[PDB]
């Protein structure tokens, strides 16, 4: 039992190091994403041209379909309804 | 992409000959399916 607990504690140390590696790298990726967003904002006329929490977990083709479906339902024809079914 | 080109490659591959177009499509399919260590491109005018 002490052998099992020692080996499982070493496995938990390796898993905590992996979670920290994921987090560090993940944080760096998030920072890069923020910079990209800032660049997009800079690139961004706009003045003349001027549900979500469930759509946070959609697949990207499903997310594009959901955005286009809500845009077409609010834009031209109001006889359209969408719903997200799953777990 | 630093933090697309496939559409430009499709607009270029519109003008390919049919055996070259079949080779392009099958090569992209085999590169996305199994072996990611493969790259294709179209050279010409």
């Amino acid at each position: 039992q002490r052998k099992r607990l020692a080996e499982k504690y070493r496995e938990c140390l390796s898993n905590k190091e992996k979670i920290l590696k994921e987090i560090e790298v993940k944080k760096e990726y998030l920072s890069s994403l923020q910079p990209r967003l800032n660049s997009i904002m800079q690139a961004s006329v706009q003045e003349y041209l001027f549900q979500y929490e469930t759509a946070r977990h959609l697949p990207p083709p499903l997310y594009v379909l959901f955005v286009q479906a809500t845009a077409y339902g609010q834009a031209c024809d109001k006889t359209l309804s969408v719903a997200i079914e799953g777990s | 992409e630093y933090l697309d080109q496939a559409h430009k490659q499709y607009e270029t591959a519109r003008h390919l000959p049919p055996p070259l177009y079949v080779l392009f499509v099958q090569a992209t399919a085999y590169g996305q399916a199994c072996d990611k260590t493969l790259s294709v491109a179209i050279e010409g005018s």
């Binding site: 994921e22 987090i23 993940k26 944080k27 990726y29 998030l30 994403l33 990209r36 967003l37 997009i40 946070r56 977990h57 959609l58 697949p59 990207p60 997310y63 594009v64 955005v67 286009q68 | 697309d4 559409h7």
Partner: peptide
């Protein structure tokens, strides 16, 4: 998991922006 969900939301937003740019290029 929260960082991965935020990164997946940013990737889905970038894909939706690319799809909107493709639809604008197809319409014009």
């Amino acid at each position: 998991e929260s960082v991965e969900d935020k990164l997946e939301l940013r990737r889905k937003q970038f894909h939706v922006l690319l799809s909107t740019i493709h639809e604008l290029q197809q319409t014009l």
